[PDB]
Predict the structure of Levansucrase.
Amino acid sequence: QKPYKETYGISHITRHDMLQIPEQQKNEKYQVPEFDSSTIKNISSAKGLDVWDSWPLQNADGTVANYHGYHIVFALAGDPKNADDTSIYMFYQKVGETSIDSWKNAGRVFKDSDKFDANDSILKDQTQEWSGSATFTSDGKIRLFYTDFSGKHYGKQTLTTAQVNVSASDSSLNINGVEDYKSIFDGDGKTYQNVQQFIDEGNYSSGDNHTLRDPHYVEDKGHKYLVFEANTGTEDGYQGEESLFNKAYYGKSTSFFRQESQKLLQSDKKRTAELANGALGMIELNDDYTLKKVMKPLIASNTVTDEIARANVFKMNGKWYLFTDSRGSKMTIDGITSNDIYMLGYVSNSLTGPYKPLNKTGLVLKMDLDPNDVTFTYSHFAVPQAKGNNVVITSYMTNRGFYADKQSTFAPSFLLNIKGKKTSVVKDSILEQGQLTVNK
């Protein structure tokens, strides 16, 4: 194949930038701080469940919502013995509280019968509930977005919404049920890969990794959007052999492209690279949360990786910040190892871009602890704050199903300082397990 250059009008996580990270990540400014294992507790209200990917009920701008005097956190949870047992639970605390012990368990958001009652063809085939976001509407409603995963249809993932009906009293929150429970998006083939395209490759035995998940709600000028993990489609730079010859995915220069592409083509990562077409996608929603417009991706990770997760975007002090998590074990970059796990980050003057890398390369957080380490954290997420130069990094701690006595739990939160196009972890800024705000 002849070399070409095509950006598809979107931004790109380039090979050149990623290659800088292994030396850069030695700087403590970009490192998840070490945590103290003897302070770490299980979520007492979750009663022997693993509790992993979690997200706060947020206002439209991403700040933490106050629901009738409570903060609310949605989280994936299930039986540590069963890797395919995943549903969304709703935890809550009185505003002002900070201890992990303050988190009460309202139980599952959904009943098993809800997917059938929804009169929704895709939803009735769901087997697991995976990650997303939740916004607190202007009329006082809890509006959930999440990923409908279908195990029996080759891992189809569908962006899905529901309103969660919750009664509030002085002592408790109670889930009464849901409504407006519906599929919104399952890809379109041209902009974002769909499940049929995954099946076309031979599904799981192909080595391809199909994603359409982790929907994150955000507004700008009263328009409603989801930004989500996806993969590219046929018209915005698809996976394939020809993709490795696109200079846009390399960056730097033609000299770098020639050197790096010939190495990649000669390596045991050629096939992985060819399949790698991760994207942070975007759609606009209507005022009833249905699909208005499929929009071009904010960024893609062709050749680098097929998996950029926990999409997140918000405005802070006049700039827009875009984040995603990614595992070193699924990347194709010399010097990035299987221990390495990142939060990457990008900045724009506008919500819809273009986005350039934070800290020159995209690196914001690095976490490289052994999977066996009790203090291992994952699914890092920046929670914006009402004011100031800090956001709060939440994550889950402890790998699923690893220890009988220590379940996946809320990690100790910490602070990340953001100014202009640079970030740094705030020295000794470790907060309580699962703490969402600086203010108390």
